[PDB]
Amino acid sequence: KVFERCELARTLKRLGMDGYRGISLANWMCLAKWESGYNTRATNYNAGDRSTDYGIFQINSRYWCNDGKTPGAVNACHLSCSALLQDNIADAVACAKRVVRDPQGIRAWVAWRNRCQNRDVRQYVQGCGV
Amino acid sequence: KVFERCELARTLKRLGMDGYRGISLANWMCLAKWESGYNTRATNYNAGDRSTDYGIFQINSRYWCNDGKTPGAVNACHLSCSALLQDNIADAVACAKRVVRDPQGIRAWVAWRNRCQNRDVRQYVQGCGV
Ligand SMILES: [Cl-]
Ligand SMILES: [Cl-]
Ligand SMILES: [Cl-]
Ligand SMILES: [Cl-]
Ligand SMILES: [Cl-]
Ligand code: NA
Ligand code: NA
Ligand code: NA
Ligand SMILES: [Ru+3]
Ligand SMILES: [Ru+3]
């Protein structure tokens, strides 16, 4: 599913993302926008370590979800990676939270570092009433 | 699916394309028309570099989507090029938004520049009530 901007913000806010471990709703919006285009079906293979990023947050098969294809893997979210390719994003929300409870926080995602960090991101929630 | 002209103008307008990065609805229409004749199933293989342009916007598998058969690929929309052949263009629109956020914007499609840039394109939207 391709969420609409304000529809995703309200969905993420309903599930407690706004302010989570310090992270504003807008920064989650920005991450998802550059990771997937708000598309729960996005995917991206990584040839360096033969892992794959899954879903609306591009969560990686090495450390966070099991896809049965990735060497040296752990399943820190205890999820089939295919659970992160589903129209319902409750599971993906739970796994993004689990990712950011580690020390480096939202810095886990490179694209967030390059596209969102230290940048104005109000554009993501302006006019959504959240 | 081959869109009818206004059908596509309403669809693209509903998916937020009017004014996106300053790109008019009319210009997106002119891009779709010269890329694929509004045909969601259009594909163009290039035996030169073995890449393929997909769907209604003819997005290329070397830079933007993964079709698992193009050398030197980077999948910047984190998307299967199959998603660019759907009747539902929601994945395609989201990927086209990612394309024009690069520094060249819409100028990425050489056809748009040969056929649309600096030209009158009001005829693509008028009568469509958009
Ligand atoms: Cl990750
Ligand atoms: Cl392209
Ligand atoms: Cl990139
Ligand atoms: Cl002329
Ligand atoms: Cl009119
Ligand atoms: Na891929
Ligand atoms: Na879920
Ligand atoms: Na994208
Ligand atoms: Ru940095
Ligand atoms: Ru507001």
From Swiss-Prot, chains A, B:
A GO cellular component entry from the record: extracellular exosome
Record keywords: Amyloid, Amyloidosis, Antimicrobial, Bacteriolytic enzyme, Disease variant, Disulfide bond, Glycosidase, Hydrolase, Secreted, Signal
UniProt keyword Signal, yes or no: yes
Group of enzyme by EC: hydrolase
C-type lysozyme domain residues: 1-130
Active-site residue list: 35, 53
Annotated EC: 3.2.1.17
Matching Pfam families: Lys
GO biological process: antimicrobial humoral response; defense response to bacterium; defense response to Gram-negative bacterium; defense response to Gram-positive bacterium; inflammatory response; killing of cells of another organism
Catalyzed reaction equations: Hydrolysis of (1->4)-beta-linkages between N-acetylmuramic acid and N-acetyl-D-glucosamine residues in a peptidoglycan and between N-acetyl-D-glucosamine residues in chitodextrins
GO molecular function: identical protein binding; lysozyme activity
Disulfide pairings: 6-128, 30-116, 65-81, 77-95
Transmembrane residue ranges: none
Further facts: Lysozyme C is capable of both hydrolysis and transglycosylation; it also shows a slight esterase activity. It acts rapidly on both peptide-substituted and unsubstituted peptidoglycan, and slowly on chitin oligosaccharides.
Disease per UniProt entry: Amyloidosis, hereditary systemic 5: A form of hereditary systemic amyloidosis, a disorder characterized by amyloid deposition in multiple tissues resulting in a wide clinical spectrum. AMYLD5 primarily affects the viscera, and the predominant clinical features are renal dysfunction of varying severity, and intra-abdominal bleeding. Inheritance is autosomal dominant.
Family: Belongs to the glycosyl hydrolase 22 family.
Subunit structure: Monomer.
Function text: Lysozymes have primarily a bacteriolytic function; those in tissues and body fluids are associated with the monocyte-macrophage system and enhance the activity of immunoagents.
Official protein name in the record: Lysozyme C
Annotated organism of origin: Homo sapiens
